[PDB]
Symmetry: D2
């Protein structure tokens, strides 16, 4: 399990500890052993008043700092997608594209060791990084990764409890998703542009799906250091829209 | 388990099906047998002409429609709280107050059958309803309910992976929460008023927590039925602030 | 001019005082003479026990309560539109459609007695009500009303300092607006649907405008009555998008 | 009247043209005469595909680019304050502190040549810059500037149609503002911190004012370059709260 270090300026660093390893930093390098000794919740004092706080990274912190090729789903959105997909332990969820494994991790927590994340990724380098990212943080073998286009997947009809999409052209996978998804259950797509949203809404009218939700998730952060207290001057204003479709009654 | 009925104007109704049972609304009645026979995503019509779609409710739907003692945590907030608490399967999470069991259900899904929700509620009538709400929707025996004030709980030290609070005066449970919480893990409190937030922040100065987050969750719904496409004219403007405090190692 | 009455639950009522006139509400009646005698910020009580405060309405208050043909531009948006149009005293601004005269009033204040609002309205019943609404609140003769479609207006070239639009199909008036608007000045359109916004943007590709802004205005109200202090549970979620196009010099 | 130049990268520059003046820029310097010749709405082509678009700056553009000491009120907020103050031509509005003259300009447009902005500023260097900023953009002599604390001002009772505040400790000027402001008219204060808001709300309970509004103005910008269309990824999340008080009935 990696560590997250924060310095006094609030800069964050993801460290994968190894014996003989050294964390380099402008106010003093620290052997990895010192980090492990301090442990999550602890500190390592260095030079000129500097102090590195040591943390077990939350899944949010991990997504935000992990290596990536494809930009991962933002934590606020991945969190909402799991709820909109109504995922509970033991469920089977279809995902494309794996990307960098950010959403994959959220999905994998939600369905747990008896559940399944069936994840597809078309690009081999993307998939390799995603697999590293997932495995470095999560040891439960409840993700089945597939190299290939979701359009071409061999899937059991009505075997999946939800379908999570994060890809540029979700209309292309709606036929496969409609086949996979249990009646009355949900597909939820993440899309940056309202034009993409409208295109998906129109495309879904050619499939057994009913539009249920189009929403924007906002996590409006405050800066509070009493007596200072105000919404942060600079916010992430937008990441993507979430589009939820419900699968038509069966047969 | 429960069924959810949806009408044409979006409105939803929770039904607990029984033999010879009848769902009664202003727009007519439907026998419970008809609902059971309808299947997932099926439709029924009352004699008065009301068309109703039949569903197994999502957790979000259930929270919003289940019988309430205290108002439950809204789904957008319970969702964010689970993420801010960083709950993974097998974890042990402390909660107060159980209330109506809404947040309890989110916490219980997050930690799974190998984890534990340790949930406290001061008011017996509230706890009884919460236990009913939880058991009607969730069959996994991973919730341990406790009658009493969290301030008066007998808790194991550094035994909990998170502390979830939804109560009026969280400053009063800070000592107990700090005792229970493992180093580097979170207390996350749900608070409607910014004054409560500021009081919690000030009180937390006397306890082994760093303030990490104060945030507002918004789920801004759009209406899209082309040509129509805009954020909904009416939204939930505010429910509560979320405050995240991270326990340090002494 | 008009008076505004406010009750205890925040609700407001516009009254036009006349000799022997009586304001009638569900919670009783007040003679118009009593309202006139009350003074600014004074209170009256109906026989039924309703307490009402007496005010000269603000423009914001007037817009929200005046008799309507078409729904007027909301105050938060009319306010932003005046700024995006960059209206200063003495300027000449083109408007369509007059509607109920809400935006007309904002525009007329901005340009002042030395400026001009040139306002077009296709529907005679709408224009008649708008003229009434404007004249009841504003005595400055700086508004020239015109019955007709803006697309069919006879306009002087490069004679206008801004073009304010609140109508369903602004793409249809782009040719006329481009003719009328001085170089470097703005057309600002109020549009409820994002689809309208995208259609306007696409249509504007064939006219001498650069797209400068597409924005949503929000005025997020708080309730503050200590201990209570939070954004209001219920807000206006959306009214319209504002689109600003800047005329270039050919 | 100054010009605002924009280059192809979207960088904006405020230029006060003068004969013999030269605008310096990495892809080619341009004599001020060329700028004036192009005029608002025109362009000056320079090197390597660069093009400077020439503009008459809007008041919004001016506030955002003008020299400052004190940070001016943001345009979205100044716009809202004028509406909340219900300012119409001919009115008399009290202001403190002048700062850099941003809000002053909004107030001066609203009340017009027959109106009055009575503006107070305690700090001489601030006032000097504010006066330059106002005079460079606005030639109407409807602003009376005062060097000094508003607390110490000689004011006519019930002579002002509105009171606009942008200063750190508005509670200190409430006695003077209550004296100045006509019954049933408004004071509106701009405050960054919710703690300041609460302090003002409590302080106003010692004066003949009724709390009417506490609000946050948001102008949520979109990026639209078809087929791209989404709320901007990065927004100004917060500037300040606006607090509106209504003056009690007279006598
Ligand atoms: N039809 C398709 N089938 C499988 N993968 C696809 C696909 N279309 C796009 N992709 C892949 O989908 C990914 C989108 S980025 C996904 C990011 C991911 N949610 C995360 O959190 O890390 C890219 O890696 C792209 O290669
Ligand atoms: N100190 C305390 N210890 C235990 N319960 C408390 C408490 N203070 C308040 N409560 C209880 O906390 C509850 C707050 S309402 C909680 C709602 C809950 N999150 C849900 O989703 O259903 C009330 O039922 C109240 O009785
Ligand atoms: N092409 C056109 N020319 C003139 N008026 C038009 C028009 N298209 C629509 N309209 C008019 O535009 C109005 C839109 S409602 C405008 C409301 C107005 N801004 C207010 O604040 O009161 C309607 O009255 C409609 O009849
Ligand atoms: N009591 C007081 N009387 C006069 N000026 C005051 C004051 N308290 C603070 N100030 C001044 O108020 C200013 C606040 S910054 C004001 C910015 C201004 N709204 C603008 O748009 O440019 C500072 O210049 C400060 O010196």
């Amino acid at each position: 399990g990696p560590l997250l270090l924060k310095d006094r300026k609030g800069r964050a660093y993801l460290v994968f500890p190894k014996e003989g390893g050294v964390f380099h930093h402008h106010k003093g390098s620290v052997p990895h052993e010192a980090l492990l000794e301090a442990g999550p919740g602890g500190v390592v004092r260095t030079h000129l008043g500097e102090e590195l706080s040591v943390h077990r990274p939350t899944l949010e912190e991990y997504l935000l700092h992990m290596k990536r090729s494809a930009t991962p789903t933002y934590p606020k959105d991945a969190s909402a997608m799991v709820t909109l997909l109504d995922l509970a332990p033991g469920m089977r969820v279809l995902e494309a594209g794996t990307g960098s494994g950010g959403l994959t991790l959220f999905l994998a927590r939600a369905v747990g060791e008896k559940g399944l994340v069936e994840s597809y990724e078309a690009r081999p380098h993307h998939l390799a990084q995603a697999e590293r990212n997932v495995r470095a943080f999560w040891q439960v073998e409840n993700v089945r990764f597939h190299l290939g286009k979701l359009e071409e997947a061999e899937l059991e009809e009505a075997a999946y409890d939800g379908v999570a999409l994060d890809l540029m052209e979700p209309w292309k996978v709606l036929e496969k998703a409609a086949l996979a998804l249990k009646p009355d259950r949900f597909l939820v797509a993440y899309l940056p542009n309202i034009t993409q949203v409208l295109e998906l809404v129109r495309a879904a009218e050619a499939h057994p799906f009913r539009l249920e939700r189009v929403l924007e998730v906002g996590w409006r952060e405050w800066e509070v250091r009493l007596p200072v207290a105000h919404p942060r001057f600079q916010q992430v204003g937008h990441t993507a829209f979430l589009v939820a479709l419900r699968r038509w009654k069966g047969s």
